[PDB]
Enzyme design. Structure first.
Site, mmCIF file in Angstrom:
data_model
loop_
_atom_site.group_PDB
_atom_site.id
_atom_site.type_symbol
_atom_site.label_atom_id
_atom_site.label_comp_id
_atom_site.label_asym_id
_atom_site.label_seq_id
_atom_site.Cartn_x
_atom_site.Cartn_y
_atom_site.Cartn_z
ATOM 1 N N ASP A 1 67.201 34.608 37.403
ATOM 2 C CA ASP A 1 65.893 34.709 36.755
ATOM 3 C C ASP A 1 64.956 35.686 37.446
ATOM 4 O OD1 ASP A 1 67.141 32.474 35.619
ATOM 5 O OD2 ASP A 1 65.213 31.509 35.225
ATOM 6 N N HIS B 1 61.768 36.360 35.481
ATOM 7 C CA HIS B 1 60.561 35.780 34.888
ATOM 8 C C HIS B 1 59.284 36.590 35.102
ATOM 9 C CE1 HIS B 1 61.822 32.035 33.068
ATOM 10 N NE2 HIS B 1 62.531 31.714 34.135
ATOM 11 N N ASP C 1 66.475 35.286 31.243
ATOM 12 C CA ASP C 1 65.137 34.815 31.606
ATOM 13 C C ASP C 1 64.323 35.914 32.280
ATOM 14 O OD1 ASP C 1 65.804 32.429 30.503
ATOM 15 O OD2 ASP C 1 65.355 31.210 32.271
ATOM 16 N N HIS D 1 64.948 31.500 27.827
ATOM 17 C CA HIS D 1 63.577 31.932 27.583
ATOM 18 C C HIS D 1 63.494 33.087 26.586
ATOM 19 C CE1 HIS D 1 60.765 29.883 30.527
ATOM 20 N NE2 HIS D 1 61.931 29.350 30.819
#
Length: 310
Positions: free
Chosen positions: A61, A63, A89, A122
């Site tokens: 990730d 993010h 993500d 996500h």
């Protein structure tokens, strides 16, 4: 006129090295539009299940933590001399989701055979509505731009096999995964369904449970036991399951006698966890090593960006 991918990447890198956040994205919405279309073309042309040859570095990730992404490229090597596989993500939670996803897409465009991006949980309309990216799109660009990203997210590949031995996916295994061809035959573009193979692959977690499969108490999909992992590895003759989908203090964490590893690359996730980020290098001889990134505050990150500009 064809896409000036060199000029787009430069603007993106410059924006990151400034250490500065701007409301306006350094790229025009028309440029953002072109990037998404070009990336989408490549995603749909390449298989749903990527089969990559080593060496390669695996990233969990990110993010939206754009400065940390630049730290990753600085420490682990910029494309295309270093081959990358990202586990998904890319947006939400972080401060600069737009810069992040755009740079990753641009690298995918420029180096389609040395740079790879998987779908995370996500990367869908539902989740981006909640954790920032929809709002960031609306605030810095527009809703039309957001929809373009979702259209692009829907075409992302789902899994990767490294050297025939390392199975790479964002979340984990599925109780309805009968063959690799089932991943290959996932129709794209697609939203993330509420159930089924794709839902599981993005949302499942490993656990030391008694049953092979139980309902995930995080709210989505299932949790799978050590037995499930051992069965999966034995069925498809894999040595390792490499996944993300969970923040871990040291950036990485093995499970079930090193048959599964979680890789997480967003240092100090949510600003709360103070975790390290990790990147897993896979050697030509299938040796797995870990480069680590320590959690820096906003000021230190700016100084590293200041530093890296020279």
């Amino acid at each position: 006129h064809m896409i000036d991918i060199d000029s787009l990447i430069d603007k993106l890198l410059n924006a990151g090295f400034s250490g500065k956040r701007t409301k306006n994205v350094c790229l025009k919405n028309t440029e953002i539009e072109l990037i998404c279309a070009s990336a989408r073309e490549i995603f749909l042309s390449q298989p749903s299940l990527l089969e990559l040859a080593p060496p390669v570095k695996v990233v969990g990730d990110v993010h939206g933590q754009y400065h940390d992404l630049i730290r990753i490229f600085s420490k682990c090597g910029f494309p295309p001399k270093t081959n990358y596989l990202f586990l998904g993500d890319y947006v939400n939670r972080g401060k600069q989701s737009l810069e992040t996803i755009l740079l990753l897409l641009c690298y995918k465009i420029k180096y389609p055979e040395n740079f790879f991006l998987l779908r995370g949980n996500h990367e869908c309309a539902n989740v981006t509505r909640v954790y920032g990216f929809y709002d960031e799109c609306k605030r810095r660009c527009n809703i039309k731009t957001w929809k373009l990203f979702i259209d692009t997210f829907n075409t992302l590949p789902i899994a990767a096999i490294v050297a025939g031995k390392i199975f790479c996916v964002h979340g984990g295994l599925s109780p309805v995964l009968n063959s690799m061809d089932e991943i290959r035959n996932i129709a794209r573009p697609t939203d993330v369904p509420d159930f089924g193979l794709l839902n599981d692959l993005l949302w499942s977690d490993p656990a030391d449970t008694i049953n092979e499969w139980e309902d995930n108490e995080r709210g989505v999909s299932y949790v799978f036991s050590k037995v499930a992992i051992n069965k999966f590895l034995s069925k498809f003759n894999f040595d390792l399951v490499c996944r993300a989908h969970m923040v871990v203090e040291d950036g990485y964490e093995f499970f079930n006698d090193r048959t599964l590893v979680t890789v997480f690359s967003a240092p100090n996730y949510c600003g709360e966890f103070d975790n390290w980020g990790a990147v897993m290098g896979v050697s030509e001889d299938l040796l797995c090593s870990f480069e680590l990134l320590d959690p820096l505050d906003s000021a230190a990150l700016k100084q590293v960006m200041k530093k890296e500009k020279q």
